[PDB]
């Protein structure tokens, strides 16, 4: 589980 994902499109 990744609470700090890559958010950028």
């Amino acid at each position, epitope marked *: 589980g*990744n*609470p*700090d*994902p*890559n958010a950028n499109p």
Partner: antibody
Framework: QVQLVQSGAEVKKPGASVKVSCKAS????????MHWVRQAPGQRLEWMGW????????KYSQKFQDRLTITRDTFASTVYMELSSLRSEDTTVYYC???????????????????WGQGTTVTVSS | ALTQPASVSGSPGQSITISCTGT?????????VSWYQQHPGKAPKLMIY???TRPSGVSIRFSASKSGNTASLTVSGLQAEDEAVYYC??????????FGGGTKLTVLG
């Protein structure tokens, strides 16, 4: 200094379009992403979408997907928002804001809108 | 929209807390909760990012945390200059972001 400078106020008729620019200075443009966020008088911030300044990939809020485009010009270090089919509810202040661009699979420390333009007022009225 | 109280007030020198309740899809899922302070006629200023990190230059009187689906900003040693509207925000997945409805902070006196 690090700043975002937006274009000036606009008055538009319903069904028109408006194109606002946001010119960046003081920092490496393609290291970042840029959001557009807007705010009706006396009301909340509303997220519209963002673009990666380097690769130009975008994501729009589904509320705006049909009538919003965000574009960038790296040589001009400028981001644009274009909002079509304007309606009275689009009367707001529009802001551009800098955020991070992460190349990794884990991205703590990248996000947070740390630099904001001064806002552009758009009035939509018949 | 994330849910915030419409207003909070305190007296000078006291502490106040502002809650921001989302869903397990945003606040409950990610460490990308930010808080913004907005004074009338000006753009928002970032006060907290990554749930609890203060950006450079922001006063240690501002701190935040989250528990489950609720994030909380605490302002200690209230000063008149802290009167503003405060917004929380969160990542919401699929490269989208969401703001709270804002809380007007009144300093009594």
């Amino acid at each position: 200094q690090v700043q975002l400078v937006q274009s000036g106020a606009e008055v538009k008729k319903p069904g028109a379009s408006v194109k606002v620019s946001c010119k960046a200075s003081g920092f490496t443009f393609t290291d970042y992403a840029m959001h557009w966020v807007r705010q009706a008088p006396g009301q909340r911030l509303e997220w519209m979408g963002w673009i990666n300044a380097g690769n130009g990939y975008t994501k729009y809020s589904q509320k705006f997907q049909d009538r919003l485009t965000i574009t960038r010009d790296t040589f001009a270090s400028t981001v644009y928002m274009e909002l079509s089919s304007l309606r009275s509810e689009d009367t707001t202040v529009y802001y551009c804001a800098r955020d991070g661009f992460c190349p990794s699979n884990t991205c703590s420390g990248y996000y947070g809108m740390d630099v904001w333009g001064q806002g552009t007022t758009v009035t939509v009225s018949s | 929209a994330l849910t915030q109280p419409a207003s909070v007030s305190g007296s000078p020198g006291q502490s106040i807390t502002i809650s921001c309740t989302g869903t397990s899809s945003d606040v409950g899922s990610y460490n990308y909760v930010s808080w913004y302070q907005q004074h009338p006629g000006k753009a928002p200023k970032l006060m907290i990012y990554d749930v609890n990190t203060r950006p450079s230059g922001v006063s240690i009187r501002f701190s935040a945390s989250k528990s489950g689906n609720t994030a909380s900003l605490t302002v200690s040693g209230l000063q008149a200059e802290d009167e503003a509207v405060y917004y929380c925000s969160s990542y919401a997945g699929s490269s989208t972001w969401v703001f709270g409805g804002g809380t007007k902070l009144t300093v009594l006196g």
